[PDB]
Design a protein around this nucleic acid. Structure first.
Lengths: 149, 48, 44, 48, 150, 357, 73
RNA sequence: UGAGAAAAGCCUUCUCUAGCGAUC
């Protein structure tokens, strides 16, 4: 990135994804998306995200990055906001309490949101969450109803 | 869209099942017999 | 709701607060269960 | 309580344990492949 | 039930009555001490026993000893140490011996007993305590080191 | 059986059987068999730990350290003291429950409630306060447990309609709550009094708007729904609701005013109202508008609804000056006009404007 | 208590004897001699045997509060 | 046999073992 053409940087990344196939690819994919937004624009990040959305070893930082790029854009298509969160909740919904909480605040705080969906998201959150994570989500939301956040 | 519709129907089904057990709620508390208080003190203005 | 042929509550003869000699009868009927095993003592 | 194991015995146990983690790692890769094909051929069914 | 408890409370009566004679403790304080002493005594005479109860009993007696020690200096009365102080010390020693007999495996209780013997008890009692410790816990060199250090 | 009824009516919580025996123990956290094997020191430790956890979250709990969570509270047993001491204890417990109500879903609040039940038997002495504390959480299972602690078997009891959720162990359904709210007026008065009392308690502490969120939402939800549920809203409902509506209008808390606005809108939607009552309602809506500057718009829009679902000449000339004197009236009216119809307000306000000019 | 000797008052050696184990390395003494650890453990163990459990919200019907002896048998 | 016989739910009176307790 520092002292070579952008096409070679993409060439390096594509070789890297072929070489590493297991859990170590998680950090590789995250830096690939971050480079796409810096070297390109929002459109370039969309093409990279579309290609890598099916390579199953993931992390929640992959989807938090994509949502963040959507917020910075002036369009802020709220339908695309939901479409990213559903994919993230499909992968890590069984264990991640924070991701469910972040989803609920988006429907409230975003000016384009529909807060009448908060009834369903809380109902959906209870069933997919398992074990200790179920307790933490309840306390965090009850902490969210009060102003302490 | 089909998935979200089922969860809308599934939520309503759970609430209706709870309502059947809980009851209509139309009934109120029943009335109670009253017995007068005895040995009640009073004031007689004849003494004035 | 009304009851007929009523009798006053009295001590029963099968109460165990009575002694075994004084008690009338255990009033127990035993049925040989089909599944129950038959065991006998037969000297060889 | 266990008995001491020879050097040749413990090597065989490691080789068997080596195959176990390699099959399990492949099975996870096979499962991820299945999720890729299912979302490509019949995506509406997978969501539901 | 309260047969043994009543024996122990009547054993505890004379030093409380002497303390009333000193003027150190008022009569209501004596009543409160008797009440809490009976409550703590009922705990350690049950058929089901816990170590927490023995520890609470010992801690209450230590706190009472400290309170008496603080009040004596302010009053200036130094007589009749044997009637009160030594009686309480023997009662606490009996409690410790019973507790150590119940739980031999707990070194921490043994060290608490040793510390109390150092602070309030005669050196021969501490010698016997160290002998009893080294009888069953000979496999720990640190205990030998502490015994030699003393 | 007349002796049986007389004895059952003569029963009192002070003479409870469980007071004199340890076969059964009421506990929010443990099975009765397990709860009958815990000492006073353990319960005191749990209560103190819960309060210490709660102190970090909210400082204002420190005032409860001395009366309810100290050695004096440990040795205290209500039966032996007089009625004055019991009344003071009831006041203190009510205040503490008002403070606990927002955090009831958190575990430390449940620990503190466990200590209070173990020591003071508020399930026998303070049924109303406990029910008021737990009511906005009626969908949760911990509400089911708190109900299960009570004894409401008698069909003449105030809370007898809560019997199924005790017998079946299921949360109370909102439909039953709404039906009993609109059919039985004592429960509605209970809800309104609880809301007013909690607001007055929390008013003193600056920056305390957040804790009253959930409760007010519940107060917003049922009453409107109750007004929807009733086939005919009789004059008793409006007579009961009017003082609390005025109290809400005179308040300064935004959520309480918002709930009052929703109640006023729904009442105006459902039932035709006498001209004097519409005049007074509009007078109170207009006069207290500028107390909260962030809720001006909704209030004006509320007025439109009140002036759209009622008779055209209901409003008089008296509220006209205060209407004209609000800051930036026309800008707000234009902002509303970009999306919604503003015809009734102008239809009222123009003929007075001509005469005033 | 662990190291407070009168030989410390009468300094006669540059050093003292060091037992490797310390009071702080252990849980500490059970008793205090001036102006609670086990009671924390009893409080924690009792809390672990609580009927309020994970998935308590998940449960559709709460188990009954109390049952007669005849029904249990 | 003849408080006829048969079944369900609530109180009362009591019986057995098995740990536990006695070490100061």
């Amino acid at each position: 990135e520092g002292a070579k053409s952008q096409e070679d940087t993409e060439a390096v990344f594509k070789k890297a994804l072929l070489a590493v196939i297991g859990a170590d690819s998680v950090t590789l994919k995250n830096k690939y998306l971050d480079w796409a937004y810096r070297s390109g624009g929002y459109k370039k990040a969309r093409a990279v995200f579309k290609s890598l959305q099916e390579s199953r070893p993931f992390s929640v930082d992959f989807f938090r990055k994509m949502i963040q790029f959507e917020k910075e854009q002036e369009s802020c298509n709220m339908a695309n906001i939901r479409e990213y969160y559903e994919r993230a909740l499909r992968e890590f919904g069984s264990a991640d309490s924070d991701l469910w909480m972040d989803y609920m605040k988006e429907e409230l705080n975003h000016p384009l949101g529909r807060p009448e969906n908060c009834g369903q998201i809380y109902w959906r959150a209870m069933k997919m969450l398992q074990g200790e994570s179920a307790e933490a989500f309840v306390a965090k939301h009850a902490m969210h109803q009060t102003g302490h956040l | 869209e089909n998935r979200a519709k089922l969860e809308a129907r599934l939520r309503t089904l759970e609430d209706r099942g709870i309502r059947k057990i809980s009851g209509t709620g139309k009934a109120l508390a029943k009335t109670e017999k009253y017995e007068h208080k005895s040995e009640v003190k009073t004031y007689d203005p004849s003494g004035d | 709701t009304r009851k007929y042929a009523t009798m006053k509550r009295m001590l029963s003869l099968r109460d165990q607060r009575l002694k075994e000699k004084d008690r009338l009868k255990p009033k127990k009927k035993e049925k040989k269960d089909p599944s129950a095993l038959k065991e006998r003592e037969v000297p060889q | 309580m266990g008995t001491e194991v020879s050097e040749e015995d413990i090597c065989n146990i490691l080789h068997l344990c080596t195959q176990v983690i390699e099959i399990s790692e492949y099975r996870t890769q096979l499962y991820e492949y299945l999720q890729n094909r299912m979302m490509a051929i019949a995506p509406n069914v997978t969501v539901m | 039930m309260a047969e043994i408890i009543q024996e122990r409370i009547e054993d505890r009566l004379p030093e409380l009555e002497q303390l009333e004679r000193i003027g150190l403790f008022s009569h209501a304080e004596i009543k409160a001490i008797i009440k809490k002493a009976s409550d703590l005594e009922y705990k350690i005479q049950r058929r089901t026993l816990f170590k927490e109860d023995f520890i609470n009993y010992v801690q209450y007696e230590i706190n009472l000893l400290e309170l008496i020690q603080r009040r004596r200096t302010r009053i200036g009365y130094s007589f009749k140490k044997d009637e009160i102080e030594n009686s309480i010390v023997h009662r606490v020693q009996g409690v410790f011996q019973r507790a150590s007999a119940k739980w031999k495996d707990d070194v921490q209780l043994w060290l608490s007993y040793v510390a109390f013997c150092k602070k309030w008890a005669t050196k021969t009692r501490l010698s016997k305590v160290f002998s009893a410790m080294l009888a069953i816990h000979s496999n720990k060199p640190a205990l030998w080191i502490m015994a030699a250090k003393w | 059986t007349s002796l049986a009824q007389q004895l059952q009516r003569l029963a009192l919580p002070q003479s409870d059987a469980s007071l004199l025996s340890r076969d059964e123990v009421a506990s929010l956290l443990f099975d009765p068999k397990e709860a009958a094997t815990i000492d006073r020191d353990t319960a005191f430790a749990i209560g103190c730990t819960g309060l210490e956890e709660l102190l970090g979250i909210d400082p204002s709990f420190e005032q409860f350290e001395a009366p309810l969570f100290s050695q004096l509270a440990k040795t205290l047993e209500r039966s032996v003291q007089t009625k004055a001491v019991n009344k003071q204890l009831d006041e203190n417990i009510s205040l503490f429950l008002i403070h606990l109500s927002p955090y009831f879903l958190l575990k430390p609040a449940q620990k503190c409630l466990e200590w209070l039940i173990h020591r003071f038997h508020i399930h026998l002495y303070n049924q109303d306060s406990l029910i008021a504390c737990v009511l906005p959480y009626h969908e949760t299972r911990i509400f089911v447990r708190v109900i299960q602690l009570l004894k409401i078997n008698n069909s003449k009891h105030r809370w007898f309609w809560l019997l199924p959720v005790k017998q079946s162990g299921v949360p109370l359904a909102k439909g039953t709550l709404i039906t009993h709210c609109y059919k039985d007026l004592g429960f509605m008065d209970f809800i309104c009094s609880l809301v007013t009392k909690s607001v007055k308690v929390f008013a003193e502490y600056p920056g305390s708007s957040a804790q009253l969120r959930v409760l007010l939402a519940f107060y917003a939800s049922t009453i409107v729904s109750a007004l929807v549920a009733a086939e005919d809203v009789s004059d008793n409902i409006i007579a009961k609701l009017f003082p609390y509506i005025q109290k809400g209008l005179k308040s300064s808390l935004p959520d309480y005013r918002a709930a009052t606005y929703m109640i006023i809108c729904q009442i105006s939607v459902k039932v035709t109202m006498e001209n004097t009552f519409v005049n007074s309602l509009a007078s109170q809506i207009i006069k207290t508008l500028t107390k909260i500057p962030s809720l001006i718009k909704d209030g004006l829009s509320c007025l439109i609804v009140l002036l759209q679902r009622q008779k055209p000449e209901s409003l008089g000339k008296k509220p006209f000056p205060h209407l004209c004197n609000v800051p930036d009236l026309i800008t707000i009216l234009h902002g509303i006009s970009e999306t919604y119809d503003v015809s009734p307000l102008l239809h009222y306000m123009l003929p007075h404007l001509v005469v005033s000019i | 208590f662990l190291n407070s000797t009168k030989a410390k008052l009468l300094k006669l050696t540059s050093s003292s004897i060091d037992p490797g184990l310390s009071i702080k390395q252990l849980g500490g003494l059970y008793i205090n001699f001036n102006a609670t650890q086990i009671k924390e453990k009893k409080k924690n163990e009792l809390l672990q045997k609580a009927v309020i459990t994970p998935d308590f919200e998940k449960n559709h019907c709460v188990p009954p509060y109390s049952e007669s002896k005849y029904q249990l048998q």
